[PDB]
Amino acid sequence: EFMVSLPRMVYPQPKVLTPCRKDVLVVTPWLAPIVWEGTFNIDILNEQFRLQNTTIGLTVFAIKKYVAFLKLFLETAEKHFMVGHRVHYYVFTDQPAAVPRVTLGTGRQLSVLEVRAYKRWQDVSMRRMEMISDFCERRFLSEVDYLVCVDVDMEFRDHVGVEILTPLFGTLHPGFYGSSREAFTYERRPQSQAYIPKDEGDFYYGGAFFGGSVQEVQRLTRACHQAMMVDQANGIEAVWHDESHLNKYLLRHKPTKVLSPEYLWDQQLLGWPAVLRKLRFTAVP
Amino acid sequence: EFMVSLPRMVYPQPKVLTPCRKDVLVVTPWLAPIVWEGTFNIDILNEQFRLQNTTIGLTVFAIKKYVAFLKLFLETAEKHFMVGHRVHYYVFTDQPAAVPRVTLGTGRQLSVLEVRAYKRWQDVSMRRMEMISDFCERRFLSEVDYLVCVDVDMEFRDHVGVEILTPLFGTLHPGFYGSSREAFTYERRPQSQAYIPKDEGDFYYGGAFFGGSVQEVQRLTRACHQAMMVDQANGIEAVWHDESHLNKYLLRHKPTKVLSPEYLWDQQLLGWPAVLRKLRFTAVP
Ligand SMILES: CC(=O)N[C@H]1[C@@H](OP(=O)(O)OP(=O)(O)OC[C@H]2O[C@@H](n3ccc(=O)[nH]c3=O)[C@H](O)[C@@H]2O)O[C@H](CO)[C@H](O)[C@@H]1O
Ligand SMILES: CC(=O)N[C@H]1[C@@H](OP(=O)(O)OP(=O)(O)OC[C@H]2O[C@@H](n3ccc(=O)[nH]c3=O)[C@H](O)[C@@H]2O)O[C@H](CO)[C@H](O)[C@@H]1O
């Protein structure tokens, strides 16, 4: 929509002849920014998004025993996720009375959406695509500008803000950002909808953190669900489930921003490398 | 609009831990790509834009003696500008019978739009904003997806393609890309609409090459024209005319891509520095 003028702001001048990072790739070959610390001035971005009255939805599934993760998830989201902006949390659970009472900042609200629990963890994980797509029909189009879709067994430890927002984003999986594409754990069986040949692939995106505009998230989640249903009719389940399908989708429909592994990390397994200036969203050990 | 799937493509894998340029800034602090050679894979971008059936309009003014520049301008545009894509050239002139007969490739067309000639070069240059804005009302919304607005006393010497396309872009002026903001020749008189204080400014954009979606170009050109009219009522003319106003606009409404000086160069005045891997669009000596 129509965008008013930014106010006067004083900040350091961008330096054309100085790279903003000398150690990492900060733009994809299709000219999508790769979001690392040092690539953005959050003061400028916060102005741009506040002037558009941006509302961010954050979807999270807490099914069966994973309700235990919600307290820390939501408490740390309150400290670090889109602070200053309008936020709507959507907690999908089979136990709607077991969502913890977390105190929310002003302009932030939470809705609990009851869903069925599948028996296998694989199905719980995979059926998020259907459940998100179903909810894009009603709630999300009327309530938010962007959707952010994450795993619950996680905590925010540092800023996750409007720098991530764009029509469609994925996040670099922390186990593969330095790997060659042949080592990526894409689905490699041609019988699956998620099949990616050994000579294709840009990145290995993590299934635990993706998002975009409601329109683009509806598209992604619908496509992944329909692909899963084809596989199921054919008696095949992708090797890494929803993540496999997400990877196939983002190969053929390129994201408009890619998040660095700052945004999806596991310190227990991978430590704190020099290349990560901040660890923003991390696995609970 | 709805975007179909990219076909299978084989190309080099992006390297997350290798910067694409070690000598230049490739992304602005508001996460707009800065377009240099080596930042983009044109095969991927050409697919994306061809699948959207993209049409690019290219506006150029050839008023009074500047009709002499059209032949080379258009001949070199045919060799280098958006080849493979639908192009519509819009030549604005006071001499509609003096446009040279340049042979166009398939899918490329040219319209001649007659306009008045102002006496002073300053006014000819400045009134392009009004003339472009007026034509965005009718022709451009129905005929093109993007508009590219350039000076005529120029030639294409290398690829200028869909890598530039985005909602709103400006180009780094070749005289100031290495300068500190205090040295930028912004309008510095507070009495002018184009005023920029000494402590503000991201880049000095060249008035000779800007563009965007028709919507965004309509906004920019309208705003610059209305600002010029206020200045004229107050008896002041911005120091660098349309370029001054363009700079004020792009300070307060940040571009979604910035073009490096590859896209706006003068080899006579500035030679061929190591930082420029290609000289794409250049002054005629
Ligand atoms: C790469 C890797 O080694 N992945 C392991 C990890 O996958 P994942 O960590 O990818 O699986 P996950 O169990 O975290 O499922 C993804 C998300 O789905 C939701 N969810 C899933 C199950 C459930 O009962 N309730 C629920 O709410 C929740 O939001 C969770 O964070 O963990 C699995 C079981 O945990 C398996 O050990 C996988 O091999
Ligand atoms: C930074 C600098 O030193 N700028 C000089 C340069 O500005 P510019 O090169 O910015 O002015 P310009 O005369 O090229 O005008 C911009 C554009 O307007 C169009 N146009 C302008 C005039 C005209 O009679 N017909 C016409 O068609 C044409 O598309 C041209 O390329 O040239 C001017 C006269 O040329 C002055 O010498 C300026 O000081």
Q: How far is A43 from chain B (nearest CA, A)?
A: 9
Distance linking the first and last C-alpha atoms of chain B: 42
How far is residue B133's CA from residue B220's CA, in Å, rounded to a whole number? 8
Kindly report the CA angle at A28 between A27 and A29, in degrees rounded to 5? 120
Residue indicated by tokens 């912004």: B186
Chain A residue numbers touching B180 (CB-CB < 8 A): 13
CB within 8 Å of A169: residues ≥ 6 apart: A210, A211, A212, A255, A256, A257, A258, A259
Residue A91 phi, psi dihedral angles, 5° rounding: -100, 115
**Is residue B243 flagged as an active site residue?**
yes
How far is residue B191's CA from residue B189's CA, in Å, rounded to a whole number? 5
Half-sphere exposure of residue A38, counting CA atoms within 13 Å on the CB side?
A: 19
Report CA(B123)–ligand 2 centroid distance (Å).
10
Say if residues A79 and A161 touch (Cβ distance below 8 Å).
no
The closest alpha carbon to A115, from A161, A162, A62, A175, belongs to A62
Q: Judge whether A173 is annotated as a binding position.
A: yes
Burial of A53 (0-12, 13-18, 19+ CB in 10 A): exposed
CB contact under 8 A, A14 and B203: yes
Residue indicated by tokens 């699948």: B51
Pairing mode, if any, of strands A154-156 and A281-283? antiparallel
**Which residues does residue A210 pair with via DSSP β-bridges, in sequence order?**
A149
How far is residue A166's CA from residue B76's CA, in Å, rounded to a whole number? 36
Kindly report the CA angle at A56 between A53 and A62, in degrees rounded to 5? 160
Kindly report the CA angle at A253 between A249 and A256, in degrees rounded to 5? 120
**Chain A with chain B: Cβ pairs closer than 8 A:** 139
CB within 8 Å of B195: residues ≥ 6 apart: B186, B187, B188, B189, B248
Helix (H) or strand (E) holding A61: strand A55-61
Residues in chain B: 285
Tokens of B127: 């009134």
Q: How far is B69 from chain A (nearest CA, A)?
A: 31
How far is residue A200's CA from residue B160's CA, in Å, rounded to a whole number? 27
Closest atom of ligand 2 relative to the B128 alpha carbon: 18
Q: Quickly list H helices, B104-213.
A: 121-135, 141-143
Could you tell me the domains of chain A? 1-285 (3.90.550.10)
Kindly report the CA angle at B169 between B252 and B124, in degrees rounded to 5? 85
How far is residue A25's CA from residue B18's CA, in Å, rounded to a whole number? 5
Q: Quickly list H helices, chain B.
A: 42-51, 70-80, 121-135, 141-143, 214-233, 241-252, 267-270
Distances (CA, A) of B18 to A21, A244, A251: 10, 26, 21
Residue type, A192: S
Residue type, B28: T
The closest alpha carbon to A110, from A151, A78, A142, belongs to A78
Say if residues A90 and A57 touch (Cβ distance below 8 Å).
yes
How far is residue A197's CA from residue A181's CA, in Å, rounded to a whole number? 10
Say if residues B107 and B131 touch (Cβ distance below 8 Å).
no
How far is residue A33's CA from residue A14's CA, in Å, rounded to a whole number? 16
Residues in chain A: 285
Chain B residue numbers touching A25 (CB-CB < 8 A): 14-20
Say if residues A275 and B17 touch (Cβ distance below 8 Å).
yes
Tokens of B167: 């909602």
Tokens of B231: 């200045």
Pairing mode, if any, of strands A257-259 and A281-283? unpaired
Helix (H) or strand (E) holding A178: none
Strand intervals (E) in A118-267: 146-150, 154-156, 168-171, 209-213, 257-259
How far is residue A271's CA from residue A284's CA, in Å, rounded to a whole number? 13
Residue indicated by tokens 């040949």: A197
Does residue B138 sit in helix, strand or coil?
A: helix
**Which residues does residue A86 pair with via DSSP β-bridges, in sequence order?**
A55
* DSSP secondary structure code for residue A262 in this structure: G
How far is residue B104's CA from residue B88's CA, in Å, rounded to a whole number? 10
Say if residues B154 and B247 touch (Cβ distance below 8 Å).
no
The residue whose C-alpha atom lies closest to atom 4 belonging to ligand 2 is B240
The closest alpha carbon to A176, from A184, A168, A166, belongs to A184
Q: Judge whether B256 is annotated as a binding position.
A: no
Q: How many other C-beta atoms lie within 10 A of the C-beta of residue A21?
A: 19
Kindly report the CA angle at A66 between A96 and A229, in degrees rounded to 5? 85
Residue indicated by tokens 């950002």: A177
Distance linking the first and last C-alpha atoms of chain A: 42
Q: Quickly list H helices, A52-144.
A: 70-80, 121-135, 141-143
CB within 8 Å of A42: residues ≥ 6 apart: A159, A161, A162, A163
Tokens of B61: 């003014």
Say if residues B282 and B157 touch (Cβ distance below 8 Å).
yes
Residue type, B38: G
Q: Judge whether A61 is annotated as a binding position.
A: yes
How far is residue B154's CA from residue B131's CA, in Å, rounded to a whole number? 20
Q: Quickly list H helices, chain A.
A: 42-51, 70-80, 121-135, 141-143, 214-233, 241-252, 267-270
Strand intervals (E) in chain B: 34-35, 55-61, 86-93, 108-114, 146-150, 154-156, 168-171, 209-213, 257-259, 281-283
Say if residues B41 and B11 touch (Cβ distance below 8 Å).
yes
Report CA(A2)–ligand 2 centroid distance (Å).
32
Q: At what angle do helices B241-252 and B214-233 cross, to 10 degrees?
A: 120
Experimental method: X-ray
Q: Which of B27, B173, B248 to mutate to test the interface with A (most CBs of A within 10 A)?
A: B27
Q: How many other C-beta atoms lie within 10 A of the C-beta of residue B178?
A: 14
**Which residues does residue A146 pair with via DSSP β-bridges, in sequence order?**
A56, A213
* DSSP secondary structure code for residue B81 in this structure: B
Helix (H) or strand (E) holding A86: strand A86-93
Say if residues A69 and A153 touch (Cβ distance below 8 Å).
yes
Say if residues A28 and A202 touch (Cβ distance below 8 Å).
yes
Ligand nearest to the CA of B175: 2
Residue indicated by tokens 């054919």: A234
Listed resolution, Å: 1.6
**Which residues does residue A41 pair with via DSSP β-bridges, in sequence order?**
none
Pairing mode, if any, of strands A86-93 and A108-114? parallel
Residue A187 phi, psi dihedral angles, 5° rounding: -65, 125
Distances (CA, A) of A85 to A78, A160, A162: 11, 12, 9
